[PDB]
Amino acid sequence: RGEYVVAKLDDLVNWARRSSLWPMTFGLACCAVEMMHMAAPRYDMDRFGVVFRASPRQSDVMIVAGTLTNKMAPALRKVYDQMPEPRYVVSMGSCANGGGYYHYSYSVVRGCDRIVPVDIYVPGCPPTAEALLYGILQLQRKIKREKRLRIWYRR
Amino acid sequence: TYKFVNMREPSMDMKSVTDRAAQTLLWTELVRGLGMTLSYLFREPATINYPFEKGPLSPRFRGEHALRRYPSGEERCIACKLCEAVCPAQAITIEAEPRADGSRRTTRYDIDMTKCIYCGFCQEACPVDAIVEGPNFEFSTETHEELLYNKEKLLNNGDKWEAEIAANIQADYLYR
Amino acid sequence: MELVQVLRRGLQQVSGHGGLRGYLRVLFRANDVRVGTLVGEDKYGNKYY
Amino acid sequence: ASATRVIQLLRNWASGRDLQAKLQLRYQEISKRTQPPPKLPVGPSHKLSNNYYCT
Amino acid sequence: MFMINILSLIIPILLAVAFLTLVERKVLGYMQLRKGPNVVGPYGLLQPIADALKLVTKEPLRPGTSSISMFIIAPILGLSLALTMWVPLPMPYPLINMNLGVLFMLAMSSLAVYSILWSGWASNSKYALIGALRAVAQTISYEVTLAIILLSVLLMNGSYTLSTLITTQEHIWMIFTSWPLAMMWFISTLAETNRAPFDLTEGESELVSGFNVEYAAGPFAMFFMAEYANIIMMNAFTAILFLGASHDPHTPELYTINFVLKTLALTITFLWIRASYPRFRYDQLMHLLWKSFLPLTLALCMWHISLPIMTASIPPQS
Amino acid sequence: SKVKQDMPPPGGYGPIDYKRNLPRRGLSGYSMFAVGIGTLLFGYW
Amino acid sequence: LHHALIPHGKGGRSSVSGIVATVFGATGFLGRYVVNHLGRMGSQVIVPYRCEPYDTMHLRPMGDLGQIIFMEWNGKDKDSIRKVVEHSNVVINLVGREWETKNFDFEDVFVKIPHAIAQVSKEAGVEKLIHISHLNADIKSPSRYLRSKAVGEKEVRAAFPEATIIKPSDIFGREDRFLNYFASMRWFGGVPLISLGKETVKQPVYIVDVSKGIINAIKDPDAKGKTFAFVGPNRYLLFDLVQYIFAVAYRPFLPYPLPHFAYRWVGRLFEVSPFEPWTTRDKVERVHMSDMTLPHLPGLEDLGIQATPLELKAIEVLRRHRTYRWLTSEMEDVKPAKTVNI
Numbered sequence A: 001r002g003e004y005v006v007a008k009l010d011d012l013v014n015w016a017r018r019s020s021l022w023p024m025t026f027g028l029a030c031c032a033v034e035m036m037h038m039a040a041p042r043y044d045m046d047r048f049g050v051v052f053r054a055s056p057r058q059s060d061v062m063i064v065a066g067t068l069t070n071k072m073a074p075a076l077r078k079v080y081d082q083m084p085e086p087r088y089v090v091s092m093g094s095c096a097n098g099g100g101y102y103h104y105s106y107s108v109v110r111g112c113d114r115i116v117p118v119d120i121y122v123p124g125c126p127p128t129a130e131a132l133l134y135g136i137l138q139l140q141r142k143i144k145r146e147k148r149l150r151i152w153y154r155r
Numbered sequence B: 001t002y003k004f005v006n007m008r009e010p011s012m013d014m015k016s017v018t019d020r021a022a023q024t025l026l027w028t029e030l031v032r033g034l035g036m037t038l039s040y041l042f043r044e045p046a047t048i049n050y051p052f053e054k055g056p057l058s059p060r061f062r063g064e065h066a067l068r069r070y071p072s073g074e075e076r077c078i079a080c081k082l083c084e085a086v087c088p089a090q091a092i093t094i095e096a097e098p099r100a101d102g103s104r105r106t107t108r109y110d111i112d113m114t115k116c117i118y119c120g121f122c123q124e125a126c127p128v129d130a131i132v133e134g135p136n137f138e139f140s141t142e143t144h145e146e147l148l149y150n151k152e153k154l155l156n157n158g159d160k161w162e163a164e165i166a167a168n169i170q171a172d173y174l175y176r
Numbered sequence C: 001m002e003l004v005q006v007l008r009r010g011l012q013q014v015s016g017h018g019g020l021r022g023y024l025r026v027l028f029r030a031n032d033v034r035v036g037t038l039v040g041e042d043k044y045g046n047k048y049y
Numbered sequence D: 001a002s003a004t005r006v007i008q009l010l011r012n013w014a015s016g017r018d019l020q021a022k023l024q025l026r027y028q029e030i031s032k033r034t035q036p037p038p039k040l041p042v043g044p045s046h047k048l049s050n051n052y053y054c055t
Numbered sequence E: 001m002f003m004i005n006i007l008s009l010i011i012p013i014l015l016a017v018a019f020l021t022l023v024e025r026k027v028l029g030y031m032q033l034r035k036g037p038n039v040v041g042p043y044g045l046l047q048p049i050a051d052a053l054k055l056v057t058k059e060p061l062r063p064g065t066s067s068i069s070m071f072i073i074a075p076i077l078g079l080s081l082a083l084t085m086w087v088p089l090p091m092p093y094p095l096i097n098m099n100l101g102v103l104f105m106l107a108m109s110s111l112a113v114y115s116i117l118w119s120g121w122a123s124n125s126k127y128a129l130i131g132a133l134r135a136v137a138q139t140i141s142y143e144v145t146l147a148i149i150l151l152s153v154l155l156m157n158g159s160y161t162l163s164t165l166i167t168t169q170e171h172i173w174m175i176f177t178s179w180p181l182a183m184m185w186f187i188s189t190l191a192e193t194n195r196a197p198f199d200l201t202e203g204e205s206e207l208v209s210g211f212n213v214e215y216a217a218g219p220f221a222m223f224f225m226a227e228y229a230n231i232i233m234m235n236a237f238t239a240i241l242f243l244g245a246s247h248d249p250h251t252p253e254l255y256t257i258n259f260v261l262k263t264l265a266l267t268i269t270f271l272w273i274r275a276s277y278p279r280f281r282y283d284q285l286m287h288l289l290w291k292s293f294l295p296l297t298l299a300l301c302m303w304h305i306s307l308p309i310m311t312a313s314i315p316p317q318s
Numbered sequence F: 001s002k003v004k005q006d007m008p009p010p011g012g013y014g015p016i017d018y019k020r021n022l023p024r025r026g027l028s029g030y031s032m033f034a035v036g037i038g039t040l041l042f043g044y045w
Numbered sequence G: 001l002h003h004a005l006i007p008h009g010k011g012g013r014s015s016v017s018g019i020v021a022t023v024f025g026a027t028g029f030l031g032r033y034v035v036n037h038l039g040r041m042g043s044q045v046i047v048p049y050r051c052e053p054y055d056t057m058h059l060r061p062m063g064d065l066g067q068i069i070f071m072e073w074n075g076k077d078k079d080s081i082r083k084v085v086e087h088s089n090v091v092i093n094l095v096g097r098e099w100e101t102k103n104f105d106f107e108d109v110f111v112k113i114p115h116a117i118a119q120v121s122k123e124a125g126v127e128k129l130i131h132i133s134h135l136n137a138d139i140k141s142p143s144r145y146l147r148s149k150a151v152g153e154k155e156v157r158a159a160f161p162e163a164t165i166i167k168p169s170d171i172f173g174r175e176d177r178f179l180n181y182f183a184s185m186r187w188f189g190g191v192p193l194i195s196l197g198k199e200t201v202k203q204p205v206y207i208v209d210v211s212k213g214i215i216n217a218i219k220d221p222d223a224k225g226k227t228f229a230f231v232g233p234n235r236y237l238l239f240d241l242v243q244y245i246f247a248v249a250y251r252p253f254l255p256y257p258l259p260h261f262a263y264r265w266v267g268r269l270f271e272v273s274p275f276e277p278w279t280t281r282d283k284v285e286r287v288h289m290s291d292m293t294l295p296h297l298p299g300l301e302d303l304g305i306q307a308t309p310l311e312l313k314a315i316e317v318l319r320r321h322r323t324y325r326w327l328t329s330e331m332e333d334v335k336p337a338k339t340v341n342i
């Protein structure tokens, strides 16, 4: 059946996507320190296929770790627009989610959402390195439930 | 009391110069660096198999918030607004009103979990141990709105993590 | 003297995980093969070791 | 998961020191996570007399 | 029976680099107390396939300021050069029995650098041109030592034919007669392939990219697979040239098993040094070769022209 | 009962070293060169 | 107005506009802009989608938290349409497709779907339904796109009487398939203008002008039942319009004359592609067909808006198509092409 063939093919692509996420570190504030602890051998982010890779031309997901200051807000959008785009954005910490501690400041945007679309939200201040691992695991589940080929077959 | 970290003058005798020359040509400190990387290769990796092996925590851990209730069943919050008054990030919003039966509780108790700093000041300020930070730290969500907890979601957390929060404060109340 | 014990210990894991079929089950779904005593069982089916 | 002596000799020699004595992994020397309840002391001002705040 | 032979080389080669990326992280992790990929398949035995399949399905894009033609041909240059270079390697019997196999590999390996800056120049990026200009003078200065080291060692061969190394080190390993040249040969191989005492070509710490600056799923995969293939060979070339093995003419499988083992051990050392040393600054890596490697290079050359003459050990030309 | 808080053991904790423990290993300078030259001489023969 | 629908604020994101839009097919060209304009004013837009949720990600950061709600809907299902429009003030129709899918032809997506949307909206009890149809909508034009659109707007008018109907001429913008379509024709050798494109007359309209036109129609009280026609200020002959595109893009120009029947054949050849087709036979007819002036219908200006000339917003679309030799050229280097009297 055509639907079955597109079903297996979609799963193959989705497996290839979720099993290789290459974060482009936007290390901004104390949320970045905890994320490096995820890369530390205690949790070993690398072991899940997900390994840190620079050059957003060669990265799949953004991990917004820290406050997003209005001065650098154009930089966040520019590095987001340059990713080969099967692409997702992970927001770490209360500050990146909706402003957090500095929600009422004059120079902190109330959440990274106002600049970029945001996938799974990671709450914390900072979210423990284990909590982020759960977040990345959630994105892998979200990638697993992608029906890109099924929608194309039913267009 | 100070110590000179780098004030070592090498000896100029025929022995020492040859060793430095032998170190130079026959790369030794590079081999010592190589030799020790081999030592760590054969060692025991410290990686914990997440999520089958969750990390070690303490009873004082601060995570997802929850409102607890008395053993009778009635909530502990009596709407003194101490938690809202001391919240450093003003993530707490409270609205109270006389209940039908008398003793009155909150009609709105919203915690902005994207504005919360998880400092734990709310659970200290609470004179009835009503608002606490539970042991959960895996409540990541796909949408920003799902983080903005209100009274109903928080009360649900209190009725879900009660079997764990009760033991934690049971082990830590004496320290406080 | 210890390599043979190591292989026997490694071979014992296939008997520990309910035979070879169970061994691949844990390997392909839990990424570990280490056996351990069963401390308890919860109502939802999770096995704690 | 303490390894075979053959590795221990190789691992020790490659690093140049006895690694089995002091290890990076905590096996059992850690304190038990279920400790007996404590009895916190009191401050110097916890007195029933001659403890006026004006002083 | 030649297309089968060629495809019995291309597919194993691309699969060798394929799982070298797995034995990279799984070795790098274990040397930094991590565990490496062990999730995708048992022990990570499927992680590179997951990596590769993603890197041929995620959106590729030419830079807006690119030069399309030179941007596309550079991955062609890198991959074809890497594959074509394995051709005269004398695994028992070489696939192509070149009379001047050594000179061939020198010429094409000197060509694998046109890919790096044609990619850099066409990308029209500030980090691209910097990385391109870093790499070219890096390789050619390291190439002068590469040529002389090969010549000095091969003076005991009597020819440039790769097959004759089997006969030359039949009783005694070549390294025992040219170990001083072996050390600089290994360092130069670390430098031509841009591993990480001199990975400044990538320069991720200071140049973020440079192997593949805006290069994406396809072209990034090539520029990776074109340099990891060079990793395996430059140790296979080191293995064949210095550490010979017994070769029974009736059972070549023993030699292939031995030859593969030496390449595997050498490749691990390439990964081993990669996580045990800092990054050479540009002037340092140029100073190391132009001011310390070359003076020893010429001196040991003159030794190896004279050595067969003084000992009456001129090797047979045939 | 009496006050009970986290306290050091009655005799105090054991010593904790802090100084550099870099060992000295390998042959002296002449020995390394001699074995390096000796290998060349045997290899040459 | 309902107690929770009274407008509040100063028009910002957190301001309560008071309109609950239900923009259909918002995962597209105009759908992106109309949601944005609704997003700025603080309007709870119920955006239904049938595509992958990932393709709707760009829609998320255009409204305050809880404003933009994503719902799953299917074209051939009354229940899905009812679910999305049950609680709404205004329903915006933007479903369309320049080609005929295997499961959806021009008949299905321009008459059947608008019929269900209009009929269900009236049963639900919405106030305004803004339906969009081509300006060149005609019952006898050979291009089934125009033919289907004419049937649909008449049917939608019957089902929903006071349903404002928009008739834009031809939108141009960042992803328009109108300026991009002509600029993309460099690959296929030269540009094969039908009859050199010396007879076709077009009146392109800026996409942003259409978007604000829709929003102004929503707030306008007189839009009930009217049938608007959105056209750009100037009016361009096809050959000169393509001249302006390639001059702004700084690309070589090869005016290939190509017979109409032959063009219909190559449109058939490109139609075979299972994926997004480069062009269809119906597309060839559309660019060959002109945009007739309809002065009787109220224009864009009547919706308190000023049209934007294409020569003012041309570099927006064609800066990308320029190579590095012309990636930094200014805006006024290329002057507007011939302007046939409007």
Ligand SMILES: COC1=C(OC)C(=O)C(C/C=C(\C)CC/C=C(\C)CC/C=C(/C)CC/C=C(/C)CC/C=C(\C)CC/C=C(\C)CC/C=C(\C)CC/C=C(\C)CC/C=C(\C)CCC=C(C)C)=C(C)C1=O
Binding pocket: A051, E007, E011, E014, E015, E017, E018, E019, E021, E022, E024, E025, E048, E049, E050, E051, E052, E055, E194, E195, E196, E199, E202, E203, E204, E220, E221, E222, E224, E225
């Ligand atoms: C600073 O330092 C740095 C480095 O290092 C010094 C680095 O390393 C790195 C790299 C980073 C890391 C290692 C970190 C982790 C990252 C990764 C692991 C990235 C992984 C990247 C990959 C590219 C994945 C690689 C993995 C795999 C599994 C690749 C697998 C390969 C394939 C799927 C393809 C294999 C080949 C195939 C199938 C060939 C098939 C061929 C055929 C069928 C035959 C073809 C030929 C013919 C038919 C011939 C006949 C035809 C004719 C004659 C036609 C004639 C035509 C005419 C017209 C005449 C970085 C960044 C760096 O910063």
Ligand SMILES: NC(=O)C1=CN([C@@H]2O[C@H](COP(=O)(O)OP(=O)(O)OC[C@H]3O[C@@H](n4cnc5c(N)ncnc54)[C@H](OP(=O)(O)O)[C@@H]3O)[C@@H](O)[C@H]2O)C=CC1
Binding pocket: G024, G025, G026, G027, G028, G029, G030, G031, G050, G051, G074, G075, G093, G094, G095, G096, G097, G098, G104, G109, G132, G133, G134, G135, G167, G168, G169, G170, G171, G178
């Ligand atoms: N010049 C022009 O193009 C003009 C166009 N219009 C009208 O504007 C409308 C939108 O145009 P535009 O945004 O450019 O079109 P696009 O093709 O860019 O977007 C069409 C939208 O409709 C949805 N859609 C189409 N067919 C179906 C279907 N069968 N089932 C479900 N959803 C469907 C699409 O979903 P998905 O993205 O998943 O495919 C998408 O949201 C159309 O009605 C068009 O005729 C009016 C005047 C001028």
Ligand code: SF4
Binding pocket: A029, A030, A031, A065, A066, A067, A092, A093, A094, A095, A096, A100, A101, A124, A125, A126, A127, B117
């Ligand atoms: S959320 Fe907390 S930890 Fe994260 S950046 Fe803000 S203040 Fe720092």
Ligand code: SF4
Binding pocket: B083, B086, B087, B088, B089, B090, B091, B092, B111, B115, B116, B117, B118, B119, B120, B121, B122, B123
């Ligand atoms: S822990 Fe969070 S909710 Fe409690 S006082 Fe601190 S910031 Fe407020």
Ligand code: SF4
Binding pocket: B076, B077, B078, B079, B080, B081, B082, B083, B084, B094, B122, B125, B126, B127, B128, B129, B130, B131
């Ligand atoms: S501090 Fe406790 S009792 Fe007081 S308002 Fe907050 S939750 Fe209620």
